[PDB]
């Protein structure tokens, strides 16, 4: 044994999604403190899953999110974590929520990918690949790419 | 895809552009190798409920536009697709095994595809909405 190993995983991506779900029964409970606190929690979760929240607006009976999601974690990981934590904390902080409702959200949510990205990007990805003789233009093209804020 | 699918209780439309290439970009994606890869990918697509809109190889890369169920996920589809084809293609073709080291690299390219949801949102909401 004693073989020490290394594993590398590199991904180049643009994964934007529109996401919306509603509270149970769709009760217009997303207001005042509740509303603010919901966005605060969700931002925290996004930060933990390298998710960039491009935009988040709440009406009163639903929330709509536009965000780029690192696929290594994935959109479901994000939705279930966002829902689960906001559902847990909110019911603990707001009594009208924990007693007047069995759950905060439903098992339902809406997801749809949007694509604010060309195709000449692909060619660039390829053209910038190695081939035994790749010294330059690689860790160059990589460092050129953007990272999730944090 | 182009319409919306339902699963469990989640309503979605998740399509992506996926690209990855042979190590050193060796132009080995041809002849029986090219065709076999396509069969393998399709077989992996079935298992992970992945619909392939379009797939094409141009010798040094493979591009797939695919509609993917977020339950399984795109990364899971990609790791499995590459792991599966690497072992099978290297096992069936000696020139992919004995020249050398691995078929693919440790990298891939993923890009989402889709049009702004507008009516569908208000529509989805109204489905549970009352």
UniProtKB/TrEMBL annotation, chain A:
<dbReference type="GO" id="GO:0006313">
    <property type="term" value="P:DNA transposition"/>
</dbReference>
<feature type="binding site">
    <location>
        <position position="59"/>
    </location>
    <ligand>
        <name>Ca(2+) 2</name>
    </ligand>
</feature>
<protein>
    <submittedName>
        <fullName>Transposase</fullName>
    </submittedName>
</protein>
<feature type="binding site">
    <location>
        <position position="62"/>
    </location>
    <ligand>
        <name>Mn(2+) 2</name>
    </ligand>
</feature>
<dbReference type="InterPro" id="IPR036515">
    <property type="entry name" value="Transposase_17_sf"/>
</dbReference>
<dbReference type="InterPro" id="IPR002686">
    <property type="entry name" value="Transposase_17"/>
</dbReference>
<feature type="binding site">
    <location>
        <position position="129"/>
    </location>
    <ligand>
        <name>Mn(2+) 2</name>
    </ligand>
</feature>
<keyword id="KW-0106">Calcium</keyword>
<feature type="domain" description="Transposase IS200-like">
    <location>
        <begin position="12"/>
        <end position="129"/>
    </location>
</feature>
<dbReference type="Pfam" id="PF01797">
    <property type="entry name" value="Y1_Tnp"/>
</dbReference>
<dbReference type="GO" id="GO:0004803">
    <property type="term" value="F:transposase activity"/>
</dbReference>
<feature type="binding site">
    <location>
        <position position="59"/>
    </location>
    <ligand>
        <name>Mn(2+) 1</name>
    </ligand>
</feature>
<feature type="binding site">
    <location>
        <position position="62"/>
    </location>
    <ligand>
        <name>Mn(2+) 1</name>
    </ligand>
</feature>
<feature type="binding site">
    <location>
        <position position="62"/>
    </location>
    <ligand>
        <name>Ca(2+) 2</name>
    </ligand>
</feature>
<feature type="binding site">
    <location>
        <position position="126"/>
    </location>
    <ligand>
        <name>Ca(2+) 1</name>
    </ligand>
</feature>
<feature type="binding site">
    <location>
        <position position="64"/>
    </location>
    <ligand>
        <name>Mn(2+) 3</name>
    </ligand>
</feature>
<feature type="binding site">
    <location>
        <position position="123"/>
    </location>
    <ligand>
        <name>Ca(2+) 1</name>
    </ligand>
</feature>
<feature type="binding site">
    <location>
        <position position="64"/>
    </location>
    <ligand>
        <name>Ca(2+) 2</name>
    </ligand>
</feature>
<keyword id="KW-0479">Metal-binding</keyword>
<feature type="binding site">
    <location>
        <position position="55"/>
    </location>
    <ligand>
        <name>Ca(2+) 1</name>
    </ligand>
</feature>
<dbReference type="GO" id="GO:0046872">
    <property type="term" value="F:metal ion binding"/>
</dbReference>
<feature type="binding site">
    <location>
        <position position="64"/>
    </location>
    <ligand>
        <name>Mn(2+) 2</name>
    </ligand>
</feature>
From TrEMBL, chain B:
<feature type="binding site">
    <location>
        <position position="125"/>
    </location>
    <ligand>
        <name>Ca(2+) 1</name>
    </ligand>
</feature>
<feature type="binding site">
    <location>
        <position position="61"/>
    </location>
    <ligand>
        <name>Ca(2+) 2</name>
    </ligand>
</feature>
<keyword id="KW-0106">Calcium</keyword>
<feature type="binding site">
    <location>
        <position position="58"/>
    </location>
    <ligand>
        <name>Ca(2+) 2</name>
    </ligand>
</feature>
<dbReference type="GO" id="GO:0046872">
    <property type="term" value="F:metal ion binding"/>
</dbReference>
<feature type="binding site">
    <location>
        <position position="63"/>
    </location>
    <ligand>
        <name>Mn(2+) 3</name>
    </ligand>
</feature>
<protein>
    <submittedName>
        <fullName>Transposase</fullName>
    </submittedName>
</protein>
<feature type="binding site">
    <location>
        <position position="63"/>
    </location>
    <ligand>
        <name>Mn(2+) 2</name>
    </ligand>
</feature>
<feature type="binding site">
    <location>
        <position position="61"/>
    </location>
    <ligand>
        <name>Mn(2+) 1</name>
    </ligand>
</feature>
<feature type="binding site">
    <location>
        <position position="122"/>
    </location>
    <ligand>
        <name>Ca(2+) 1</name>
    </ligand>
</feature>
<feature type="binding site">
    <location>
        <position position="61"/>
    </location>
    <ligand>
        <name>Mn(2+) 2</name>
    </ligand>
</feature>
<feature type="binding site">
    <location>
        <position position="58"/>
    </location>
    <ligand>
        <name>Mn(2+) 1</name>
    </ligand>
</feature>
<dbReference type="GO" id="GO:0004803">
    <property type="term" value="F:transposase activity"/>
</dbReference>
<feature type="binding site">
    <location>
        <position position="128"/>
    </location>
    <ligand>
        <name>Mn(2+) 2</name>
    </ligand>
</feature>
<feature type="binding site">
    <location>
        <position position="63"/>
    </location>
    <ligand>
        <name>Ca(2+) 2</name>
    </ligand>
</feature>
<dbReference type="GO" id="GO:0003677">
    <property type="term" value="F:DNA binding"/>
</dbReference>
<feature type="domain" description="Transposase IS200-like">
    <location>
        <begin position="11"/>
        <end position="128"/>
    </location>
</feature>
<keyword id="KW-0479">Metal-binding</keyword>
<dbReference type="GO" id="GO:0006313">
    <property type="term" value="P:DNA transposition"/>
</dbReference>
<feature type="binding site">
    <location>
        <position position="54"/>
    </location>
    <ligand>
        <name>Ca(2+) 1</name>
    </ligand>
</feature>
């Amino acid at each position: 044994n004693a073989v020490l190993y290394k594993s590398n995983h590199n991904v180049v991506y643009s994964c934007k999604y529109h996401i919306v779900w509603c509270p149970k029964y769709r009760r217009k409970v997303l207001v005042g403190a509740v509303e603010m606190r919901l966005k605060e929690i969700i931002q925290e979760v996004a930060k933990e899953l390298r998710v960039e929240i491009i935009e988040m607006q709440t009406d009163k009976d639903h929330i709509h999110i536009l965000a780029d999601i690192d696929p290594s974690f994935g959109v479901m990981k994000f939705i279930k974590t966002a829902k689960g934590r906001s559902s847990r904390i909110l019911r603990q902080e707001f009594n009208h929520l924990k007693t007047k409702l069995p759950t905060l959200w439903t098992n339902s949510c809406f997801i749809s990918t949007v694509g604010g990205a060309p195709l000449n990007v692909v060619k660039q990805y390829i053209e910038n690949q190695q081939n035994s003789n790749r010294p330059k233009q690689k860790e160059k093209w990589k460092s050129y790419v953007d990272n999730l804020q944090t």
